[PDB]
Amino acid sequence: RPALLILELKSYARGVRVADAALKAAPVRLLKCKIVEPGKALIMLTGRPEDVEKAYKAALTVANKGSGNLIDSVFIPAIHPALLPFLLEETPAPPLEDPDRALLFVEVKTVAAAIRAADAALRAAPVELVRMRLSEHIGGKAVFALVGDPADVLRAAAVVAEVAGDQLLDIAIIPRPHPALLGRE
Amino acid sequence: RPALLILELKSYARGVRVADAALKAAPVRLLKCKIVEPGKALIMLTGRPEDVEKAYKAALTVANKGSGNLIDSVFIPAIHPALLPFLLEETPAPPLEDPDRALLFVEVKTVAAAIRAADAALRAAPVELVRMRLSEHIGGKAVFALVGDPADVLRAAAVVAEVAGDQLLDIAIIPRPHPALLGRE
Amino acid sequence: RPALLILELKSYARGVRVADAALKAAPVRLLKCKIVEPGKALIMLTGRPEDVEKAYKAALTVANKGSGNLIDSVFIPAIHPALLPFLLEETPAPPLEDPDRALLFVEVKTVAAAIRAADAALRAAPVELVRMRLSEHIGGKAVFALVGDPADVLRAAAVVAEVAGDQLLDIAIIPRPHPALLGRE
Amino acid sequence: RPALLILELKSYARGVRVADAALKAAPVRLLKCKIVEPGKALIMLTGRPEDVEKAYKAALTVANKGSGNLIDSVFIPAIHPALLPFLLEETPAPPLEDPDRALLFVEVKTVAAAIRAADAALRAAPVELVRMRLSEHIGGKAVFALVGDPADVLRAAAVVAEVAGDQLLDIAIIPRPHPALLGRE
Amino acid sequence: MLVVYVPEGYSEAQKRALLFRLAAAVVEATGTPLENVRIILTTYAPADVLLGGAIGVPLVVILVYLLEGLSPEQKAALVKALTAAAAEALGVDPENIRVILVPVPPENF
Amino acid sequence: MLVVYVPEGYSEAQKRALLFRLAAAVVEATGTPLENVRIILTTYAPADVLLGGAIGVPLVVILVYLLEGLSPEQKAALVKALTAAAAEALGVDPENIRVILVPVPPENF
Amino acid sequence: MLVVYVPEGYSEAQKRALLFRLAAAVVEATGTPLENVRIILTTYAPADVLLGGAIGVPLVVILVYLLEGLSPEQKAALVKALTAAAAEALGVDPENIRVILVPVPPENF
Amino acid sequence: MLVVYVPEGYSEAQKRALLFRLAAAVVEATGTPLENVRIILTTYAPADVLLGGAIGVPLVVILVYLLEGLSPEQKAALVKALTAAAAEALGVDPENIRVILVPVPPENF
Question: Any idea what the Cα angle at residue C163 is, between residues C160 and C166, rounded to 5°?
């Protein structure tokens, strides 16, 4: 169970600065320090738990969290395995094998809270990601779809709504696919 | 003369839902159910005339047209052949063979009304498309250029202005090219 | 020392028109007449000094500079050699060979003034570009990083701030890299 | 089934003018071109269907419908027989013969829409008028009462409400009369 | 007693005509005089209801309180009349109208 | 049919999650597909209700309309699931949730 | 030179299409290139003009300045084309469009 | 009589100087006293005119009403003087100034 650190900033040169300071403190590898639509800097880092944590508080001190420059900062010590193929690159999930599995779809404004809700749902609910997209050709939004049993899907929806709160922008539930959208959803 | 159905939505999860319902009703193939800049869902469908029509009214009932979720919905029973190479993929048109052909350029805010005006002009005026672009790396706009005889170009401009109405954002007319822009326009 | 002409327009069909008129007057080659995020037309031209200049005033007369259609128009007779590999295509600069070289980063709202400040700094200060990006997947912004000696970097920062003025949106200075960001900045 | 044309105007001299033009075009007889409370011009014409129709469009062109001078203009090709005794003069209907017949009463602001709703109800519902009054000693309102079977009366009420829409000002239903108001309603 | 739950966003004319048509259908079907026919309805927020995994789609529900002694066939006639009346009144598909009634015991009404 | 009476002053996220969790509990307990599960709820003024000599204290009430043929044990399972779901959804003590259901006769639904 | 007097109260799209269609008709009829075709128009107050004892009714007037050497038949062709173009452009009856042109002397233009 | 059509968006000083310079040119060229020289001009909307397939570009037009007996050479002198005067007055290229005059018949003026 590796850790993650996410930084959403507006003064993206200041984001460069805070990333540089964070790696000054720690030998934490870099995942992505890039700007995305609509012009917001996104930073992803991972490494040893304590190392990531101390680098995180150092970065918080450096960037002056709470003054408006930081849209969101999310820390997490334990991350799900299936996240890594999704986060590192667009990895298409295997097609659904049981047509009975209902589908769940969400939408929140900020990516940091998006993956925060994703991790919270995964910890609370045994559900599996299928498709996901972050901050690219989107205008700042982010998506990720879920599939599974009706009861599991509904409880996961409840959990993700609770965690997202006001960050949520939309949610939807698809009861049943059929081959014209099964795989073609 | 095939038909087309276009759906421009803001709640793009709701767009997913309405697309799923539309294919629940009908065996209509999917052309594109994708989000574009600045974060709007675009849906294109085609099939048998009556099939497309009944799927269309089913989708209208499902999505509650007129409540603000639907930016535009355009139905059309007959579509021009040259549209298909343009719509399916970016197909470069053959270069102009007569330098005398004047050029016409338009710009409207929404793609649905854009192609509505395009089809209206094609039905009313025998004119030929050259370059076109939809909702990609544009911020939501859409373009398509026309060429031809002065009289034909001017009457097509009148028709397209009439059809576009308030949807129009800009229009322009190029009288004459010369090799520094002929092909390099 | 070649020249350059830059045109930032909002009525991009009008930008097409003004580009056509400019090449009507002059045999000036075209670099890029393309729209970029968030939907602004960018035009770059180069050629003989007097030819570029007269084409420029012709274009100014045609497009009615000052009426709001023209965001910015920048003329320059002499341009730096290292600009050409950056402007023509994304050309990665060679990695820094001396770790002591401090780093400089800027951000302004408009590309025309961005390169105006870049050229002004180059004329005033012997500094070398490393990374640069213009109006692509950015929402209209533009970036370019500088490296070099502390004194040179600081004086270049002063010059670029002076030239940019209100066009500036952000600026930052990195004192020291180390291999975790040296090349991985 | 004769036709009717109704014209409600505010610039009553302009109403005189439009009536004169209408009879310039057509040999359509005049029913009433008179001003009523609160100072609005009312015009009623009848004749051959096509003759009435072409005179109607001529009058619409002359009076510039939609500019605010025309409160309402209602065209109708087929009119009910019992209307004629009511419209031409105040003709008292025969007293009700069955006490079980419930009563219906309506009120809308404009006479044109009033008779439009009346005709729509008559076409949709077999109901019979009893008392009626138009624009005289009323301040611009108009009344007409209906009688009949509970089911018929209720469905007629639904139809008249639907047709009147926002033109409606009031509606009421009397379940049962008894001789102290039977004939003395 | 009738209680009808409806979405919000309907013109006063629309619900007025709905009331008239519902009263018409009830009276013509059960044959009772207007003197004993009562109808009541209220609205709910659009962002408030769920309909099979969808939220915000409209859904009309009818609740009736009726006295026994009515044969099943006339009960079905009432159900069909109410359904058709509501559907035509507001132009919504019958799949979005759920009609339900309750036999109020004679010792109860 | 479900009708839930609730107090006013709840976030849209809160009642949204409440809807999802209630649907989850109903579906998992009675085993019906989502296609036949409908839920509706509305709010009342805080200064409007009385609760045992107290006025203004919150009180949530559940009303269900369910078809016969369900054994009492699964009826109790539904009751318990609904109670726990609502209580966890809004964090109010179970003494403030009253759940009630009605067997809609087969000739009636 | 063209000067067109029109009433006020027309959409920007309407007069825009009017300009395009008038240019089309002129170019196709007289055969001149777009490089030498100029058109100008302005509006007047509705309460400002009289039309045969009527005030406020719309009236469109066309004024053209054209060079000699054009035979009468093509002059009539221009007149008819302009009339039809304007009438279709704004949907007003041709009796409300008065078209007039002037032969600018060769020593004058 | 002079009538000049101009775009809108010009300072009062600008058109004032334009009037003075136009009067100067007319008087010096035709040699008439100030007592018989009259000039009038008006503006049009920028979104109103077309200029060779372009809309919104400025275009100034001059119309003169002049008495016969003037030889063609002095007519050309008047034309050139007016063109240069307007162009220098508003700094617009001469291609955007179209000047036109009409010989008012002696039995007519």
Answer: 105
Q: Quick check: helix, strand or coil at residue A171?
A: strand
Residues pairing with A34 in the sheet: A42
d(CA G76, CA G79): 5
Q: Is B62 on the interface with E (CB under 8 A)?
A: yes
CA distances from residue D128 to D101, D117, D118 in whole angstroms, order as listed: 11, 14, 10
Q: Strands, E, within chain A: which ranges?
A: 4-9, 29-36, 40-46, 70-76, 102-108, 128-134, 142-148, 168-174
Chain G residue with the nearest C-alpha to that of H42: G42
Please, where are the H alpha helices in H1-109? 12-30, 72-90
Q: Do B14 and A170 touch (CB under 8 A)?
A: yes
Closest Cα partner for D157 from E25, B7, C181, E102? E25
Yes or no, beta carbons of B13 and A171 under 8 Å apart: yes
Whether F and A touch (3+ CB pairs < 8 Å), yes or no: yes
Chain G residues in contact with D68 (beta carbon < 8 A): none
Name the residue with tokens 């599974």: A148
Written in H, E and C, the secondary structure of B91-102 is: CCCCCCCCCCCE
Cα Rg, chain E, nearest whole Å: 14
C-beta of residue F41 within 8 angstroms of C-beta of residue F4: yes
**CB of A62 within 8 Å of any CB in chain C?**
no
Best mutation target, H48, H59, H100, to test chain G (most G CBs within 10 A): H48
Whether residue C61 lies within 8 A of chain H, CB to CB, comes out as: yes
Contact call for residues F40 and E44 (beta carbons, < 8 A): yes
Closest CA to A155 of A132, A182, A124: A124
- The string of DSSP codes covering F38-72 is EEEEEEE-GGG-EETTEES---EEEEEEEES---H
Closest Cα of chain G to D111: distance in Å? 26
In the sheet that H40-44 helps form, which strands lie side by side, from edge to edge? H40-44, H2-7, H60-67, H97-104
CB–CB of A56/A6 below 8 Å?
Answer: no
- Give chains near E: 3+ CB pairs under 8 A: A, B, D, F
The SS3 of residue D182 is: coil
| DSSP one-letter string for C57-69 | HHHHHHHTTTSSS
Question: For chain D, give me the number of helices (H) and strands (E)?
Answer: 5, 8
C-alpha–C-alpha distance, residues C98 and B183, integer Å: 48
User: What letter would DSSP give residue A99?
Assistant: T
* E45 alpha-carbon distance from chain centroid: 18
Q: What is the CA radius of gyration of chain F?
A: 14
Helix (H) or strand (E) holding C6: strand C4-9
Greatest Cα pair distance in chain A: 53
Neighbours of A120 (CB within 10 A): 18
Minimal Cα distance from F35: which residue of A? A175
Question: Is B20 within 8 Å of A174 when comparing Cβ atoms?
Answer: yes
Q: Which amino acid makes up residue C17?
A: R
E35 exposed, middle or buried (CB, 10 Å; 0-12, 13-18, 19+)? exposed
The answer to whether H54 contacts B102, with C-beta atoms less than 8 Å apart, is no
Taking an 8 Å cut-off on Cβ atoms, the answer to whether G57 and D62 are in contact is: yes
CA-closest candidate to residue H49, choices C70, G100, G16: G16
Q: How far is D150 from chain G (nearest CA, A)?
A: 50
Residues of chain B found within 8 Å of residue G36, distances taken between Cβ atoms: none
Name the region of F68 (left: φ>0; alpha: ψ -120 to 50; beta: rest): beta
Task: Please answer yes or no on whether B138 and C35 come within 8 Å at the CB atom.
Answer: yes
CB B142 within 8 A of CB B108: yes
SS3 D43: strand
CB C176 within 8 A of CB C102: yes
